[PDB]
Design an enzyme around this catalytic site. Structure first.
Site, mmCIF file in Angstrom:
data_model
loop_
_atom_site.group_PDB
_atom_site.id
_atom_site.type_symbol
_atom_site.label_atom_id
_atom_site.label_comp_id
_atom_site.label_asym_id
_atom_site.label_seq_id
_atom_site.Cartn_x
_atom_site.Cartn_y
_atom_site.Cartn_z
ATOM 1 N N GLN A 10 19.871 12.291 80.773
ATOM 2 C CA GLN A 10 18.768 12.163 81.738
ATOM 3 C C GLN A 10 18.027 13.508 81.923
ATOM 4 O OE1 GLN A 10 17.812 9.231 83.175
ATOM 5 N NE2 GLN A 10 19.458 8.076 82.144
ATOM 6 N N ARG A 45 14.461 13.777 80.636
ATOM 7 C CA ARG A 45 13.316 13.377 81.471
ATOM 8 C C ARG A 45 12.500 14.558 81.986
ATOM 9 N NH1 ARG A 45 13.035 8.041 83.383
ATOM 10 N NH2 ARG A 45 14.896 6.787 82.914
ATOM 11 N N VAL A 93 -3.418 21.647 77.469
ATOM 12 C CA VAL A 93 -4.619 21.456 76.645
ATOM 13 C C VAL A 93 -4.986 19.988 76.492
ATOM 14 C CG1 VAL A 93 -5.619 21.770 74.361
ATOM 15 C CG2 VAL A 93 -4.114 23.499 75.325
ATOM 16 N N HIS A 143 9.913 23.106 71.739
ATOM 17 C CA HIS A 143 9.939 23.963 70.562
ATOM 18 C C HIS A 143 9.617 25.394 70.935
ATOM 19 C CE1 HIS A 143 10.662 21.508 66.959
ATOM 20 N NE2 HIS A 143 10.029 20.533 67.586
ATOM 21 N N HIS A 160 17.446 23.773 67.969
ATOM 22 C CA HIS A 160 17.676 22.688 68.943
ATOM 23 C C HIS A 160 18.710 21.679 68.447
ATOM 24 C CE1 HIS A 160 14.456 20.473 66.778
ATOM 25 N NE2 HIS A 160 15.114 19.403 67.191
ATOM 26 N N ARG A 212 -5.983 30.025 84.837
ATOM 27 C CA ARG A 212 -6.596 29.937 83.525
ATOM 28 C C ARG A 212 -7.250 31.269 83.085
ATOM 29 N NH1 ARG A 212 -5.429 25.008 80.681
ATOM 30 N NH2 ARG A 212 -6.478 25.280 78.665
ATOM 31 N N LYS A 270 8.401 -3.961 41.555
ATOM 32 C CA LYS A 270 8.582 -5.378 41.819
ATOM 33 C C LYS A 270 9.453 -5.990 40.709
ATOM 34 C CE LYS A 270 4.985 -8.200 41.621
ATOM 35 N NZ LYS A 270 3.905 -9.236 41.717
HETATM 36 O O1 LIG Z 1 -9.826 25.040 82.194
HETATM 37 C C1 LIG Z 1 -9.007 24.185 81.903
HETATM 38 N N1 LIG Z 1 -8.079 23.759 82.816
HETATM 39 C C2 LIG Z 1 -7.094 22.804 82.564
HETATM 40 O O2 LIG Z 1 -6.305 22.503 83.457
HETATM 41 C C3 LIG Z 1 -7.101 22.267 81.260
HETATM 42 N N2 LIG Z 1 -6.257 21.312 80.695
HETATM 43 C C4 LIG Z 1 -6.673 21.160 79.464
HETATM 44 N N3 LIG Z 1 -7.748 21.966 79.157
HETATM 45 C C5 LIG Z 1 -8.393 22.000 77.851
HETATM 46 O O3 LIG Z 1 -7.962 23.168 77.190
HETATM 47 C C6 LIG Z 1 -9.039 23.602 76.320
HETATM 48 C C7 LIG Z 1 -8.809 25.050 75.938
HETATM 49 O O4 LIG Z 1 -8.603 25.863 77.127
HETATM 50 P P1 LIG Z 1 -9.711 26.907 77.615
HETATM 51 O O5 LIG Z 1 -11.079 26.404 77.243
HETATM 52 O O6 LIG Z 1 -9.448 27.288 79.037
HETATM 53 O O7 LIG Z 1 -9.297 28.126 76.679
HETATM 54 P P2 LIG Z 1 -10.262 28.787 75.601
HETATM 55 O O8 LIG Z 1 -9.419 29.681 74.753
HETATM 56 O O9 LIG Z 1 -11.106 27.718 74.945
HETATM 57 O O10 LIG Z 1 -11.147 29.748 76.531
HETATM 58 P P3 LIG Z 1 -12.699 29.621 76.934
HETATM 59 O O11 LIG Z 1 -13.295 28.504 76.087
HETATM 60 O O12 LIG Z 1 -12.555 29.233 78.411
HETATM 61 O O13 LIG Z 1 -13.407 30.937 76.690
HETATM 62 C C8 LIG Z 1 -10.316 23.275 77.122
HETATM 63 O O14 LIG Z 1 -11.527 23.162 76.363
HETATM 64 C C9 LIG Z 1 -9.925 22.003 77.906
HETATM 65 O O15 LIG Z 1 -10.419 20.785 77.387
HETATM 66 C C10 LIG Z 1 -8.035 22.688 80.314
HETATM 67 N N4 LIG Z 1 -8.977 23.632 80.643
HETATM 68 N N1 LIG Z 2 -9.079 17.498 66.701
HETATM 69 C C1 LIG Z 2 -9.068 16.963 67.915
HETATM 70 N N2 LIG Z 2 -9.187 15.622 68.142
HETATM 71 C C2 LIG Z 2 -9.156 15.149 69.426
HETATM 72 N N3 LIG Z 2 -9.001 15.944 70.529
HETATM 73 C C3 LIG Z 2 -8.871 17.292 70.367
HETATM 74 C C4 LIG Z 2 -8.893 17.894 69.027
HETATM 75 N N4 LIG Z 2 -8.763 19.205 69.144
HETATM 76 C C5 LIG Z 2 -8.685 19.457 70.472
HETATM 77 N N5 LIG Z 2 -8.738 18.305 71.192
HETATM 78 C C6 LIG Z 2 -8.748 18.049 72.655
HETATM 79 C C7 LIG Z 2 -7.843 18.936 73.495
HETATM 80 C C8 LIG Z 2 -8.681 19.348 74.672
HETATM 81 O O1 LIG Z 2 -8.294 18.479 75.731
HETATM 82 C C9 LIG Z 2 -10.118 19.164 74.202
HETATM 83 C C10 LIG Z 2 -10.684 20.519 73.842
HETATM 84 O O2 LIG Z 2 -10.083 21.074 72.663
HETATM 85 P P1 LIG Z 2 -10.916 22.141 71.788
HETATM 86 O O3 LIG Z 2 -12.205 21.521 71.301
HETATM 87 O O4 LIG Z 2 -10.011 22.712 70.722
HETATM 88 O O5 LIG Z 2 -11.244 23.094 73.040
HETATM 89 P P2 LIG Z 2 -11.247 24.689 73.095
HETATM 90 O O6 LIG Z 2 -11.535 25.105 74.524
HETATM 91 O O7 LIG Z 2 -10.009 25.188 72.361
HETATM 92 O O8 LIG Z 2 -12.635 25.032 72.303
HETATM 93 P P3 LIG Z 2 -13.572 26.355 72.477
HETATM 94 O O9 LIG Z 2 -13.549 27.088 71.135
HETATM 95 O O10 LIG Z 2 -14.819 25.593 72.885
HETATM 96 O O11 LIG Z 2 -12.945 27.221 73.560
HETATM 97 O O12 LIG Z 2 -10.114 18.278 73.082
HETATM 98 N N1 LIG Z 3 -1.620 0.712 52.719
HETATM 99 C C1 LIG Z 3 -1.690 -0.423 53.418
HETATM 100 N N2 LIG Z 3 -1.588 -0.420 54.753
HETATM 101 C C2 LIG Z 3 -1.644 -1.581 55.440
HETATM 102 N N3 LIG Z 3 -1.840 -2.780 54.852
HETATM 103 C C3 LIG Z 3 -1.957 -2.890 53.496
HETATM 104 C C4 LIG Z 3 -1.891 -1.683 52.697
HETATM 105 N N4 LIG Z 3 -2.064 -2.039 51.428
HETATM 106 C C5 LIG Z 3 -2.216 -3.379 51.399
HETATM 107 N N5 LIG Z 3 -2.162 -3.884 52.632
HETATM 108 C C6 LIG Z 3 -2.286 -5.313 53.070
HETATM 109 C C7 LIG Z 3 -3.128 -6.311 52.262
HETATM 110 C C8 LIG Z 3 -2.329 -7.605 52.295
HETATM 111 O O1 LIG Z 3 -2.677 -8.463 53.384
HETATM 112 C C9 LIG Z 3 -0.909 -7.138 52.483
HETATM 113 C C10 LIG Z 3 -0.142 -7.007 51.174
HETATM 114 O O2 LIG Z 3 -0.818 -6.128 50.279
HETATM 115 P P1 LIG Z 3 -0.083 -5.475 49.012
HETATM 116 O O3 LIG Z 3 1.005 -4.572 49.483
HETATM 117 O O4 LIG Z 3 -1.263 -4.898 48.318
HETATM 118 O O5 LIG Z 3 0.567 -6.762 48.309
HETATM 119 P P2 LIG Z 3 0.330 -7.235 46.782
HETATM 120 O O6 LIG Z 3 0.726 -8.698 46.700
HETATM 121 O O7 LIG Z 3 -1.059 -6.858 46.277
HETATM 122 O O8 LIG Z 3 1.562 -6.353 46.173
HETATM 123 P P3 LIG Z 3 2.634 -6.771 45.034
HETATM 124 O O9 LIG Z 3 2.225 -5.988 43.816
HETATM 125 O O10 LIG Z 3 3.895 -6.391 45.710
HETATM 126 O O11 LIG Z 3 2.466 -8.230 44.769
HETATM 127 O O12 LIG Z 3 -0.981 -5.851 53.068
HETATM 128 MG MG LIG Z 4 1.581 -10.230 45.806
HETATM 129 MN MN LIG Z 5 14.731 17.147 66.363
#
Ligand SMILES: O=c1[nH]c(=O)c2ncn([C@@H]3O[C@H](COP(=O)(O)OP(=O)(O)OP(=O)(O)O)[C@@H](O)[C@H]3O)c2[nH]1
Ligand SMILES: Nc1ncnc2c1ncn2[C@H]1C[C@H](O)[C@@H](COP(=O)(O)OP(=O)(O)OP(=O)(O)O)O1
Ligand SMILES: Nc1ncnc2c1ncn2[C@H]1C[C@H](O)[C@@H](COP(=O)(O)OP(=O)(O)OP(=O)(O)O)O1
Ligand SMILES: [Mg+2]
Ligand SMILES: [Mn+2]
Ligand SMILES: Nc1ncnc2c1ncn2[C@H]1C[C@H](O)[C@@H](COP(=O)(O)OP(=O)(O)OP(=O)(O)O)O1
Ligand SMILES: Nc1ncnc2c1ncn2[C@H]1C[C@H](O)[C@@H](COP(=O)(O)OP(=O)(O)OP(=O)(O)O)O1
Ligand SMILES: [Fe+3]
Ligand SMILES: [Fe+3]
Ligand SMILES: [Fe+3]
Ligand SMILES: [Fe+3]
Ligand SMILES: [Mg+2]
Ligand SMILES: [Mg+2]
Ligand SMILES: [Mg+2]
Ligand SMILES: [Mg+2]
Ligand SMILES: [Mg+2]
Ligand SMILES: [Mg+2]
Ligand SMILES: [Mg+2]
Ligand SMILES: [Mn+2]
Ligand SMILES: [Mn+2]
Ligand SMILES: [Mn+2]
Lengths: 466, 470, 466, 470
Positions: free
Chosen positions: C28, C31, C42, C101, C119, C329, C391
């Site tokens: 537990q 948790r 972030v 981590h 770990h 921040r 197959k």
């Molecule tokens: O201000 C925040 N308070 C929060 O509780 C928080 N929780 C998530 N985030 C996200 O974290 C990213 C990077 O953090 P952040 O933007 O503060 O650092 P950063 O290194 O980008 O610095 P800067 O962009 O402010 O210059 C941001 O874009 C947010 O979307 C927070 N930001």
């Molecule tokens: N590749 C991603 N796809 C979806 N969400 C993402 C991705 N990367 C970051 N995020 C999320 C985490 C944050 O909640 C929010 C902002 O992340 P990010 O664009 O990396 O902000 P940042 O503050 O690090 O950028 P900046 O360089 O503008 O400071 O989007």
């Molecule tokens: N990578 C994938 N991820 C999710 N669904 C897939 C993927 N590839 C194929 N499918 C779908 C399409 C079909 O509805 C079903 C079975 O496809 P597939 O594995 O291509 O069978 P198949 O009959 O062509 O293979 P076999 O050579 O074993 O007969 O899964």
């Molecule tokens: Mg088949």
């Molecule tokens: Mn592990």
């Protein structure tokens, strides 16, 4: 085994016999029939067809029957039994016509009053045609099915009978509860369509089929073995029937989905006398008689809509002109909704007569669509027909009445909804329709329409009762 | 410049730099350490989410709706000043939730300090003044065209209600008081956020589409005051939302075991309350229950305190620590059953304390041992239908608002809008004990003419023939 | 059985023995430890903890081992064997410290260089403590486990050894592949965390674990029985390792998530000498020594962050002031990213020395975080260590080299990423850092930083090579 | 007034009344009867979706992005005139897909009319003129402040490209040509819609976040022309999008069996083509392959034609009907295996026709029987890296755009950006036959120094020792 990726249920293994059943003209026909029919023209996500519904239903029929088997080996569920349920699941919607429910629900009733016919009576005949025209009867013997017994058992799972069951005994009665449950309507049909229709409609489901199966169990209930739910699941069951009703309100009876269904149905009627469909030994059938020959009914699918719209024969100018009015979105205009009162039901006898009541506009101009909304068992509460069981005593089944659950559950379990549309579309016309219709409600002592003060300012003071 | 953040419910959301300043403070980051569903986590293991992320969604949605009304209706004069104030109310509206959110204001404080009346909102408002004051926000608001004398009032009043009864905005901007917390009928964006988010994390699917509601919302004159209105067609969906909600409370928020864990924690806190000092304003020491009187000290009071107790070793906490270990090991007080009042019997908050005594009294063929939890379940407005307090509008006449009574909607809607649920748990856990509890409890139901418990024939075979009425 | 609703995997049945293991202080504890640690600050969706990861991993360990069992009865997989795999799954992350981590990856390495500790070594010791302090050893016998054999088998599933395996023979080797796969890293650990982390992060997963299990099979491969995939799955396996790498880029190594991890780690270091944690027989331990007593390590959780922030003892002004800088921040400002070139690896030996290289600012001011990114097996392609099958010949296993799959797969399978942050935050400071850092890259013949022309206009003409 | 529609991918989307007028026409509603993935439906049973709903999403997203740039950057002078034109391009950009979408323009027309060069886009533009002209739209555009001489050009040019090479808008509004179909690098909202929608229906999850991309998009000067730009940090995500795409083609769009069904249909059409009249402009009769020359007749040509054939009974179609029945019964041409060229051997479109002859030639110990499908797989720009043609921008200097080469991103990105895949199927289906095909094919690979097929040791035990190189 053979795996297929359905986006609702994931990868599902099909037994090679089920694959043989699937790869036939009779079944692949379901690729060309839309599940919600007219719904596609309102919910543009709803392209799905009965083919993929039909696979989920089979899949879930297997899930549940393997599950009962595992949990309870004392039931003697065989691989023979499991296959038969799966097959019923697969073939249970084989008989839906063009636009699914529009066909059996609007078209056939108007076009051939003389018959009683339902997509299930069709699902059973189409099943015999499938088995017969594709040498399946041999292949069943091959995997230890016994056709004389099992085709009956399958046919009876779909429709009901033909202790009233030739296919399996009172000790295997719970198997008749899986694909289509007459006892209370709790079937895996619903489970599949809830999940699938929501997926494609863009509405979220509130109901967890996976959980229900985890708590299912088979118990003696009056020298017949029924399926039972944990006592705690009861809340969730009332919710499922609500979810359903909720789906019908939002989507399956959408005021415009319904009028599109109706417009297609009228176009079919306009075309019916003039479209030959080729059946058994070259005999020609009409759209409405095609349900009497499964060779010809195999050919009858949503195609026929386009066969009509893209036609050029002038004896179809009638029907083609309607269907163009859908393409252009000149629909018949909706006028309003209302409900009966006290204890006034509305006989299926009287539907045809209702436009006459509503009428200067002629009654040829009005359409009046009467929709019954229930929890599956007309006036009855289907939970009153479900057997539950406690953690303490897992074989002692029990009943649970509404008042041991909540006071926030419904007082009535069925209602009627009446909707008036007008076929003449302009503002001069549609105002008239709106005055006729609101006086009609006041005359019949129906409810003030939601919009009633706004569309009929000079009429809703007629009724003190509003 | 804007700042984007990825909430998994609402997606990437742009935060105005003022909102960021408010967020990055001890008072707000405190919400990272308070679980939304509290005891729920110990039943629904998905429900790790905290009020921090709920608080962001609610702000986001407060903005969505107010920009939307603005766009659709320029005649409303919604300013960037107004939009910011609503967003800020959204953000800060749950600032005052205590440890385990509802367990604190709903079970603990009531038992621990009968002398006060206090709710997470009274707290949300005080914590808001503390935040503003301790972090030089007051300047920054002027900087973006807010007017603190007016706007901090307007914010405080969005959260709680008053203190035409509103100093913050006129009758012509009344619809703004409807967004974050709607007294008129409870249709607020708070609900919208928690439905989506709690479902996400609980592993239930939501049936309610907030995006759709906003598309059809519109502001109309209703009694020389400007309220929000819904399309006539939306009415069905509104009855469903209040159902969804009630449905969530049945499945999750009032789960028989989530509730008994909430209760066990609450008792552990009570056991610890006299003996735990929390340091506030000017070094003054406060107890868990008095900390709500000092926002410096209440800033420190979070879910931490559970572990502060469990991991302790001071023997004046053997009491409370031993309870909390009984949760870790899963010796819960055993649930006995549920039942409901009959006819039109409500159960006075006066009489809750007396109910275990009643259960010990029953004579089938001690009350210190029983717990009896009474749960009121409504559609937000005690006995009233909240749809009866919503204004709708037709396609034909988009400014003419109207009423829609239940009878114009369905006969499959609920007859009553509020009910009570009574649940008995027993603190003595063994088979000899728990059988006894199950006989006492079932005779109790029969004595009070309450409902046969669903499991009643099975747990009490010799007692459910006592009632012919069953 | 006992059902629990995890939102990723649904309702999952727990064997009563697994419930007994779960309902202990040692378990537990999970948790109160966040899966992605610094990520929560972030990605505000990422509140999830190791507790619920730990249940999914158990669940999936069972799924796969039941599945192989069903598909192949000839393997002799027993209910004894299934339970043991499930238990390994459950207990495999028992040893993660505060912020997962960050603890084993940053803190312990800085705070106690003298030990090697991970770990997993912790997961194994915490498992012995759990078993011993809660009378589990009896309950295992009760369900037909054999502790002398099975606790070994479990301990060895988690860590590896201690044919090198005392727990099960070469004929049951495929069981060592499920929870933590040394052969190639294809474990159900990954499957759970992909799905779960994506769910909570608000990124979508591209990888289908359910499908992989459908096509798994056990085959002889060099007188040891390994798990094998269909030939067609190979594409999907290269994609999984990509998905993973993709998760690390976006989320697990986010430039700011990492600096928060680092700031916490520094605060812990500031607090470490001054925080006593009570262990076995009242002996007091520090945060860094607590890994040497499982009684005391039970108490060590994310709590300690708040224990510090909410403290008031002045020998913790150091650490408390850092943690307040997170609440407000004021993070250490990021300066830029760069990469080594040709065949320059960077010895874990030299990490400590790197700020000195970067330096008027002192090198006490810089932080330099070196991140290794691979496909799990340092320089090796893990698909080159997977056995596939056709197959046609379902027992004849085979190898599939990269060039039978695509030319759009990666040329290298591991890289380094170097990131410089500065602890002095103002614009005068941060400019300086940006000039130091860009000249540093040019000096070491590292890559022009993405932003390099913009932050260092007067330095990127220094290098012709850019 | 606006009109809302519930697409399950994008939610409720408001349609401007002009867009509704365009939608409710025979030319557009035609897309209801054409499947997006065509043959895919017969492998992925979820893939019932049609181009109609793709066409709406693409319009919706075309608007999203252009409103977004507008808001973020008022200096761009994006007008309601401009926004409408982009939305309309989005809507009408796939108007010209034939039956089974890509099967038509990609397999059928090339085999059936070598004499023309034609693509669904050349068709999308002609069908657009037909739509506008046959339904009195030209008036309605003036009505909402469009200028047809200018704007129908601008729309036509968004779809296809030209006809500074653009009559429709200046170099100062060039970024608008980047939205619906991006020639510069392929980063268009077409992709965004189809990724989300195809995944939804296929039962694969998407890994690519279009919403995020839009948040960070921005318009910058790049060589005295105004292009769209991405944040520097987005670059990783862009390499991933092009991967996602390629990944979709592997799994789904080039599925070995989906492709052979596409091919079987295409052959059935060819069998039927001489013998099926489709009625066009002034009653003139057209064949399936010539119908692309008359938009009146091409309006009628939809997936219907499959069933028109299968359900027919005229014996001049026994040919084609018998093929299509072989799909219903699932007698497909059997797949034999896959292989790839080696070193730097491309395979000229010149030589496709000759490849079955080669396979019959191989002498392990007729070519009318084999089919050989050559599939080119790239990141959209044949051999080029499309990221090398994207402009990025830093947080520090938001107008100063920059380039980012692959080497500043990762070493785990692809070495090559385009490859070929060769697949052999056999039209003779039995065990005697299919073994033979498997020996021919494997010796063929060894002869051409192609890759050992993955299944090669198993299907050809006595032939994969022929190559030491394997
Ligand atoms: O201000 C925040 N308070 C929060 O509780 C928080 N929780 C998530 N985030 C996200 O974290 C990213 C990077 O953090 P952040 O933007 O503060 O650092 P950063 O290194 O980008 O610095 P800067 O962009 O402010 O210059 C941001 O874009 C947010 O979307 C927070 N930001
Ligand atoms: N590749 C991603 N796809 C979806 N969400 C993402 C991705 N990367 C970051 N995020 C999320 C985490 C944050 O909640 C929010 C902002 O992340 P990010 O664009 O990396 O902000 P940042 O503050 O690090 O950028 P900046 O360089 O503008 O400071 O989007
Ligand atoms: N990578 C994938 N991820 C999710 N669904 C897939 C993927 N590839 C194929 N499918 C779908 C399409 C079909 O509805 C079903 C079975 O496809 P597939 O594995 O291509 O069978 P198949 O009959 O062509 O293979 P076999 O050579 O074993 O007969 O899964
Ligand atoms: Mg088949
Ligand atoms: Mn592990
Ligand atoms: N209606 C529901 N829908 C989905 N999940 C639910 C529902 N009700 C409860 N859960 C969740 C919470 C738990 O993680 C898991 C088991 O809950 P529940 O069925 O309440 O078991 P329980 O142990 O309280 O019942 P029992 O009385 O059988 O012991 O499922
Ligand atoms: N309850 C619902 N939840 C989600 N989507 C819905 C619901 N009802 C309808 N829809 C979908 C279907 C359509 O694609 C879109 C419009 O439906 P609806 O609002 O009923 O339009 P309508 O045109 O019938 O209204 P109006 O009265 O404005 O003419 O929303
Ligand atoms: Fe059905
Ligand atoms: Fe709230
Ligand atoms: Fe793990
Ligand atoms: Fe497109
Ligand atoms: Mg039914
Ligand atoms: Mg930032
Ligand atoms: Mg509220
Ligand atoms: Mg339980
Ligand atoms: Mg691992
Ligand atoms: Mg409408
Ligand atoms: Mg394109
Ligand atoms: Mn049916
Ligand atoms: Mn609140
Ligand atoms: Mn296109």
């Amino acid at each position: 085994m053979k795996v297929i990726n359905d986006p609702i249920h994931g990868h599902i293994e099909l037994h090679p016999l089920l694959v043989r059943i699937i790869n036939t003209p009779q079944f692949q026909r379901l690729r060309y029939i839309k599940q919600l029919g007219g719904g596609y023209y309102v919910f543009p996500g709803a392209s799905h067809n009965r083919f993929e519904h039909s696979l989920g239903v089979g899949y879930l029929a297997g899930c549940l029957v393997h599950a009962l088997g595992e949990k309870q080996p004392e039931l003697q569920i065989s691989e023979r039994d499991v296959l038969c349920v799966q097959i019923a699941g697969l073939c249970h919607d084989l008989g839906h016509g063009p636009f699914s429910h529009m066909f059996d629900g609007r078209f056939i009733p108007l076009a051939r009053p003389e018959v009683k016919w339902t997509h299930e009576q069709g699902s059973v005949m189409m099943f015999e045609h499938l088995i017969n025209s594709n040498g399946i009867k041999p292949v069943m013997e091959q995997y230890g099915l016994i056709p004389e017994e099992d085709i009956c058992f399958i046919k009876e799972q779909i429709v009901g009978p033909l202790w009233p069951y030739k296919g399996r005994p009172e000790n295997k009665s719970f198997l008749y509860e899986i694909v289509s449950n007459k006892r209370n309507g709790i079937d895996v049909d619903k489970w599949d369509y809830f999940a699938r229709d929501c997926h494609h409609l863009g509405i979220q489901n509130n109901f967890d089929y996976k959980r229900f199966i985890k708590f299912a169990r088979v118990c003696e209930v009056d020298n017949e073995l029924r399926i039972c739910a944990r006592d705690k699941e009861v809340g969730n069951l009332y919710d499922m029937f609500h979810t359903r009703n909720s789906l019908h309100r939002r989507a399956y009876q959408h005021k415009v989905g319904n009028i599109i269904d109706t417009m297609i149905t009228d176009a079919f009627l306009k075309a019916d006398d003039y479209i030959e469909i080729t059946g058994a030994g070259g005999k020609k059938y009409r759209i409405s008689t095609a349900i009497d020959d499964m060779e010809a009914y195999t050919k009858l699918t949503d195609n026929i809509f386009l066969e009509i719209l893209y036609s050029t024969d002038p004896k179809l100018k009638d029907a083609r002109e309607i269907l163009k009015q859908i393409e252009y979105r000149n629909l018949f205009k909706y006028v309003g909704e209302t409900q009966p009162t006290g204890q006034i039901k509305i006989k299926r006898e009287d539907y045809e007569s209702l436009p006459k009541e509503v009428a200067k506009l002629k009654a040829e101009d009005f359409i009046v669509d009467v929709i019954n909304m229930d929890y599956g068992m007309q006036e009855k509460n289907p939970i009153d027909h479900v057997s539950f069981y406690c953690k303490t005593a897992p074989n002692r089944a029990i009943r649970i009445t509404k008042n041991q659950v909540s006071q926030l559950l419904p007082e009535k379990f069925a209602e009627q909804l009446i909707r008036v549309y007008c076929k003449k579309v302009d503002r001069k016309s549609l105002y008239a329709a709106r005055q006729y219709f609101v006086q009609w409600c006041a005359d019949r002592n129906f409810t003030k329409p939601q919009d009633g003060d706004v569309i009929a300012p000079l009429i809703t003071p007629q009724k003190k009762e509003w």
